[PDB]
């Protein structure tokens, strides 16, 4: 048999609702349609289950609807959460009856759970060092746009901070890397049309 | 809590699976590799103790060991690259929610590497501590300091926050592992109220290849 | 140092080689059972990685393991009472004496029996302790004094004294072993020279059902 | 193939020669022939080959008449021990010329040694006891010929003598039991058509 999930990567907004599609191309009498769920830690969790001749399955905020003439089957989500960001597969159990059958799978729909909208929040720019490499801590931001330059003279080594998400709704950010004049390297923040530097908080 | 394991070419691995199953009768055996589906591979049976192999796969590839009531290992031979990925374990248990259907419960995961480089020998993770900026504490009164770890291999690892006193591991922020020249680097980094500045706080790291297979113990000095 | 593994019916065994050999390229395997002779149950190639059985034996009962370099193990499928045996390990070496002809060399036996009892739990050797008589030291001047294990199964088991100072082993004697309802039983005794009357002595016990798996010492007062 | 050996068990003194006999039927036109040997704790120890073509093996104290005519192989020890008491067996290497061939083994002949003819000698009667059970320990003697019996007024268990070699030369024994009263309890000897009693040692 063969399942389909044309889908790669979706991105939605907190508290709003999602579908995803599977088309299953079947030759057998009776079956059953199972939902899953792994988490980026390769671990896998049973999540619904439809049936053939039983009506709309819904288990608290899981609502499946199902078309038995072009079988297609469409996953819902009423609320989101910023733990559902996980890759969501379609199963299909052949018959579905027996303790010695398998599972066929699709190959999976990741999502993923954004912020919703905050006012302008202005960075705040620290510095901490050790040995030889430096970083520059920046604080809360809103925007995600924002470009850091660290003024120095010999460069080794300069990587991507981060994109992370802090619990308070504004994003945070480390950026990394090390130079060889290491007494006293500052860097230079830029939000909002802005340059906020690193000295000006003491 | 998934793991790793690591071997050279032209040599066996073992795989084992941790369910908790009583009225045990069949174990399905898969693997998830990247790009790719899911996909079943063999199945083995309690009671008469026979390996069922799928259509296309050779014989002497696929092992199923009990070394004691209730427990199952699966042993793989002659690896070569193509081999690589995460493996489960599966039995048709109704069940864990204890419901009228039969659903077929999941394992943990395996990460399996096949190497052939075999270069360096300390490839365990190395630390180092930044110490927060006490400029840092006097504007909002709160400590953030950064853990650095480097020089790993391979990329699965893991990081937690502790406070040296309970059993409760402290939310805290996480970075994303970059690869520098065939080797792996990672850090993260926390924050500290005011309120417990003076009490001292850990971070331990979960890898493969620890020394002496224990977790490794990141000691942070309170905040003066 | 034949060691023992017991095992009831329908269930699996290992059996560990003992060999160290680092340019091998086939291992055997052969059985000894009661009043017949050795026969070899099958080989191993070492490069292609597999298994080659005999004439009569099902497939799927004997796998090959290796669980790291120049390591190797036995692993057996569906036990029945026939199965019990001695097992061991061989490959042709020119060799252990530094010869010239191809000669096969054979590990160290390991005995599996195969039960369907399950009677008992507390399976070790029980010690019990014989101090000389007071006649004995006066008249000869020297001292000889006895040591008693009871209640045990299997019966595979060993026997040293020690004198707590030196790591070397005294010269005792040995009974035999004798069939007690279902167990067995053991004793043995040493001689002690009257130099060696305040000194200490030990007496230790090597079997597959001791506590935590490690070997009694056993403490006789000077 | 087939691999014979007729006798179960023989009997020597020490200082002595003895011989065991293996007969074979092969159908090779070269072969090897194995002589093994098995210690009471299961050790298997290489002790000489023969060879189809080679002429009478001789190594230490191992030598091999070998009958190619009436396939017929004998294996001969000069001076025994005491350490000499284990099975030997007879062993076809089919063929025994590349890695791969395997053996033919026999059913084993097992010897046993026993010590020289000494003059005679009397027991000494000793006895310990703890608890209950209580064992009566009869000293050097000879010959090995004795009925060593515990009177005592009731017994509930009783066991056979343990005669063992000595590193003298003459035998030492131990005969256990347990009884209800064991506070007088004493060993009767009768050896060499006298009997020594164990309070004439007090």
């Known amino acids: 048999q063969k399942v389909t999930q044309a889908q790669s990567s979706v991105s939605m907004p907190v508290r709003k609702a999602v579908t995803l599609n599977c088309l299953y191309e079947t030759s057998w009498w009776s079956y059953y349609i199972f939902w899953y769920k792994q988490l980026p830690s390769k671990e896998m969790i049973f999540l619904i289950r439809?049936?053939?001749?039983?009506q709309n399955a819904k288990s608290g905020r899981y609502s499946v609807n199902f078309k038995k003439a072009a079988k297609s089957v469409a996953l819902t989500i009423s609320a989101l959460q910023l733990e559902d960001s996980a890759k969501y597969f379609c199963?299909?159990?052949?018959?579905?009856?027996?303790?010695?059958?398998?599972?066929?799978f699709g190959k999976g729909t990741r999502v993923t759970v954004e912020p919703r909208s905050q006012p302008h929040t202005k960075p705040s720019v620290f510095v901490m060092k050790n040995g030889t490499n430096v970083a520059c801590l920046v604080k809360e931001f809103y925007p995600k746009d924002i470009r850091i330059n660290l003024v120095s003279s010999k460069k080794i080594t300069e990587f991507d901070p981060a994109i992370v998400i802090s619990p308070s709704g504004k994003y945070n950010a480390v950026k990394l890397g090390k130079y060889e004049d290491s007494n006293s390297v500052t860097c230079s923040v830029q939000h909002d049309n802005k340059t906020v530097h690193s000295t000006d908080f003491e | 809590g998934t793991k790793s394991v690591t071997r050279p070419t032209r040599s066996s691995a073992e795989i084992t699976c941790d369910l908790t199953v009583i009225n045990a009768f069949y174990i399905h055996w898969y693997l998830h590799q990247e790009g790719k589906a899911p996909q079943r591979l063999l199945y083995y049976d309690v009671s008469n103790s026979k390996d069922v192999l799928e259509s296309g796969l050779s014989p002497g590839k696929y092992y199923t060991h009990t070394p004691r009531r209730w427990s199952w290992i699966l042993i793989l031979r002659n690896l070569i690259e193509n081999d690589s990925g995460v493996y489960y374990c599966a039995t048709w248990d109704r069940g864990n929610p204890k419901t009228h259907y039969y659903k077929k419960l999941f394992g943990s995961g395996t990460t399996l590497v096949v190497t052939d480089k075999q270069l360096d020998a300390d490839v365990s993770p190395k630390p180092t501590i930044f110490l927060p900026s006490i400029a840092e504490t006097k504007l909002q009164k709160a400590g953030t300091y950064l853990c650095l770890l480097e020089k790993f291999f391979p990329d699965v690892i893991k990081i937690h926050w502790q406070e040296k006193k309970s059993n409760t591991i402290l939310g805290s922020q996480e970075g994303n592992t970059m690869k520098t020249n065939d080797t792996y680097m990672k850090f993260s980094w926390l924050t500290v109220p005011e309120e417990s500045l003076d009490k001292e706080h850990r971070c331990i790291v979960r890898h493969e290849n620890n020394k002496n297979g224990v977790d490794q113990e990141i000691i942070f000095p309170p905040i003066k | 140092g034949t060691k023992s593994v017991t095992r009831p019916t329908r269930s699996s065994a290992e059996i560990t080689c003992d060999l160290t050999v680092i340019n091998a390229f086939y291992i055997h395997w052969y059985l000894h059972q009661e009043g017949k002779a050795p026969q070899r149950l099958l080989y191993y190639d070492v490069s292609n990685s597999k298994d080659v059985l005999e004439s009569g034996l099902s497939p799927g009962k004997y796998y090959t393991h290796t669980p790291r370099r120049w390591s190797w193990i036995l692993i057996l499928r569906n036990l029945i009472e026939n199965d019990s045996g001695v097992y061991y390990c061989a490959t042709w070496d020119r060799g252990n004496p530094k010869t010239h002809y191809y000669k096969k060399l054979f590990g160290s036996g390991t005995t599996l029996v195969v039960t369907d009892k399950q009677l008992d739990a507390d399976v070790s050797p029980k010690p019990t302790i014989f101090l000389p008589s007071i006649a004995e030291t006066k008249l000869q001047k020297a001292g000889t004094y006895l040591c008693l294990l009871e209640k045990f199964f299997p019966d595979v088991i060993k026997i040293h004294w020690q004198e707590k100072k030196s790591n070397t082993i005294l010269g005792s004697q040995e009974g035999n072993t004798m069939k007690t309802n279902d167990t067995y039983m053991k004793f043995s005794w040493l001689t002690v020279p009257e130099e060696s009357l305040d000194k200490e002595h030990r007496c230790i016990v090597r079997h597959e059902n001791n506590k935590n798996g490690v070997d009694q010492e056993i403490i006789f007062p000077p | 193939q087939k691999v014979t050996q007729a006798q179960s068990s023989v009997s020597m003194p020490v200082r002595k020669a003895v011989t065991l006999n293996c007969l074979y039927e092969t159908s090779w036109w070269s072969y090897y022939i194995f002589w093994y040997k098995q210690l009471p704790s299961k050790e298997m120890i290489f002790?000489?080959?023969?060879?189809?073509?080679?002429?009478?093996?001789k190594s230490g104290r191992y030598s091999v008449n070998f009958k190619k005519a009436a396939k017929s192989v004998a294996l001969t020890i000069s001076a025994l021990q005491l350490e000499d008491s284990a099975k030997?067996?007879?062993?076809?290497?089919?063929?025994?010329?590349?890695?791969?061939?395997?053996?033919?083994?026999?059913?084993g002949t097992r010897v046993t040694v026993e010590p020289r003819s000494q003059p005679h000698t009397k027991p000494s009667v000793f006895v310990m006891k703890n608890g209950t059970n209580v064992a009566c320990l009869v000293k050097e003697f000879y010959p090995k010929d004795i009925r060593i019996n515990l009177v005592s007024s009731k017994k509930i268990t009783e066991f056979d003598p343990a005669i063992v070699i000595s590193p003298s030369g003459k035998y030492n024994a131990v005969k256990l039991g347990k009884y209800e009263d064991s506070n007088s309890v004493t060993c009767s000897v009768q050896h060499d058509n006298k009997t020594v009693h164990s309070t004439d040692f007090e």
């Open positions: 199963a299909l159990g052949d018959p579905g009856g027996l303790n010695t059958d398998k599972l066929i």
């Open positions: 439809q049936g053939s001749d039983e």
